[PDB]
Amino acid sequence: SAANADFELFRVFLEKTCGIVLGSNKQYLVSSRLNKLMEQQGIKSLGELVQRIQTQRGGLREMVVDAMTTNETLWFRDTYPFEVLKQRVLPELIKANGGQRLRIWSAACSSGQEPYSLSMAIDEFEKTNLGQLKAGVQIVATDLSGSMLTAAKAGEYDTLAMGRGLSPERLQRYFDAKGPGRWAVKPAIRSRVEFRALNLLDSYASLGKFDMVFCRNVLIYFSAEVKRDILLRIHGTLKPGGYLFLGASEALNNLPDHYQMVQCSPGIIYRAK
Amino acid sequence: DERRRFHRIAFDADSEILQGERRWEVLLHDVSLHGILVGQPQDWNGDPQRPFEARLYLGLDVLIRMEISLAWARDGLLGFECQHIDLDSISHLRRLVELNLGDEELLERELALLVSAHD
Ligand SMILES: Nc1nc2c(ncn2[C@@H]2O[C@@H]3COP(=O)(O)O[C@H]4[C@@H](O)[C@H](n5cnc6c(=O)[nH]c(N)nc65)O[C@@H]4COP(=O)(O)O[C@H]3[C@H]2O)c(=O)[nH]1
Numbered sequence: 001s002a003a004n005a006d007f008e009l010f011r012v013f014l015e016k017t018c019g020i021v022l023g024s025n026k027q028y029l030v031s032s033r034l035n036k037l038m039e040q041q042g043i044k045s046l047g048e049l050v051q052r053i054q055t056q057r058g059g060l061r062e063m064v065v066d067a068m069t070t071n072e073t074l075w076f077r078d079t080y081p082f083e084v085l086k087q088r089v090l091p092e093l094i095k096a097n098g099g100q101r102l103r104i105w106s107a108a109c110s111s112g113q114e115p116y117s118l119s120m121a122i123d124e125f126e127k128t129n130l131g132q133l134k135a136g137v138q139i140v141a142t143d144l145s146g147s148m149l150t151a152a153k154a155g156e157y158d159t160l161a162m163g164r165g166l167s168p169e170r171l172q173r174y175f176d177a178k179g180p181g182r183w184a185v186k187p188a189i190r191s192r193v194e195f196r197a198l199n200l201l202d203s204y205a206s207l208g209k210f211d212m213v214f215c216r217n218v219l220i221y222f223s224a225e226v227k228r229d230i231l232l233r234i235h236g237t238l239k240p241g242g243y244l245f246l247g248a249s250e251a252l253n254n255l256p257d258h259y260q261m262v263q264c265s266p267g268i269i270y271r272a273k
Numbered sequence: 274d275e276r277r278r279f280h281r282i283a284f285d286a287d288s289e290i291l292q293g294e295r296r297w298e299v300l301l302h303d304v305s306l307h308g309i310l311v312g313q314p315q316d317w318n319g320d321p322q323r324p325f326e327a328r329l330y331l332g333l334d335v336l337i338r339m340e341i342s343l344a345w346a347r348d349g350l351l352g353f354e355c356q357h358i359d360l361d362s363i364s365h366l367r368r369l370v371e372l373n374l375g376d377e378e379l380l381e382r383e384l385a386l387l388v389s390a391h392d
Pocket residue numbers: 274275276277344345347352
């Protein structure tokens with residue numbers, strides 16, 4: 001009774017202040033996205049947050065909008081790309097450099113589901129291929145400094161983030177329960193991922209060279225010209241023969257002398273020429 | 274000096290303007306956290322007194338949908354101010370602005386101005 005009314009005031013607040021239209025059956029999404037902010041502010045209920053917002057202000061309204069408009073990332077998004085990674089790409093790159101250190105770039109990693117998905121995939125490949133990766137595989141994940149990047153580094157996720165895309169097998173193998181409704185990636189998964197504050201419009205020179213670059217569902221946020229520049233400069237970080245991953249419904253449709261499209265049965269990847 | 278609260282980003286995704294039963298394909302010029310600029314279409318029957326709806330088609334997965342009002346028209350251009358926007362659309366729009374601003378302080382300041390627009 002009382003909790004539902006609070007959600008309705010929050011809904012109204014979003015509409016009357018920012019013009020944001022929430023919609024219904026987003027109560028659970030709201031609670032998830034506001035959770036850390038509320039803990040930091042000592043706010044124990046949605047209703048308490050609403051009253052606190054309109055009276056104190058002082059940057060709190062901006063913090064709620066920041067948290068509320070931060071989009072979630074999915075675990076192992078599209079599934080097939082990580083399978084192509086383990087059963088096609090890793091075996092090829094490994095067979096090509098003698099087991100040297102492989103490096104993977106997860107660009108615009110957001111809250112971290114992608115880099116951690118890659119880490120888990122690497123771990124699964126290694127358990128069946130002991131000794132192939134002599135130097136192991138380094139994962140570098142980048143995004144803008146901010147709330148998302150901070151949460152990703154911590155590697156903890158709530159019920160909503162774990163109840164989709166993550167198998168029961170993977171939940172036990174790679175995560176540790178951290179109180180009610182909260183899980184954290186095990187050290188083994190965490191320590192192969194290095195997070196760096198770096199935006200796609202910043203230079204990539206400090207990142208070094210990669211055998212694989214994951215830049216999925218993010219290029220859509222740039223004009224045609226800016227996208228082409230990003231793709232060109234990404235090419236500069238790739239070792240020749242290295243691969244770029246774009247995401248299920250994105251095509252490159254450009255730069256034929258820099259990138260060769262390749263069909264992987266399920267999927268497409270781009271080899272750096 | 275600067276009267277613009279939100280930085281306007283050069284952007285050229287496939288775009289539509291809607292009003293009631295009419296739709297126009299428009300050429301997008303720029304986009305911001307709180308509006309857009311588009312080329313005036315050839316069959317512009319638009320009623321500036323009533324609300325419009327814009328749809329920005331960034332990719333197969335991502336659609337930014339917003340209710341807009343015409344703020345000005347000059348030299349074959351149309352300036353629109355964002356009114357109502359659903360949670361999903363404003364999240365994609367914020368991500369676009371974020372990635373293109375590349376500065377957390379600049380983003381924070383724009384979000385602050387979004388909230389205080391109706392103070
Ligand atoms: N009501 C309204 N009308 C708008 C708005 N933005 C553009 N217009 C109209 O479009 C014309 C072109 O603006 P511009 O191309 O950016 O070219 C502008 C712009 O480069 C610059 N400028 C003028 N005022 C400002 C400002 O307040 N802030 C910034 N950053 N630039 C300005 O001077 C040029 C000519 O200024 P305008 O004569 O005013 O001519 C402007 C104005 O008639 C808006 O947000 N609200």
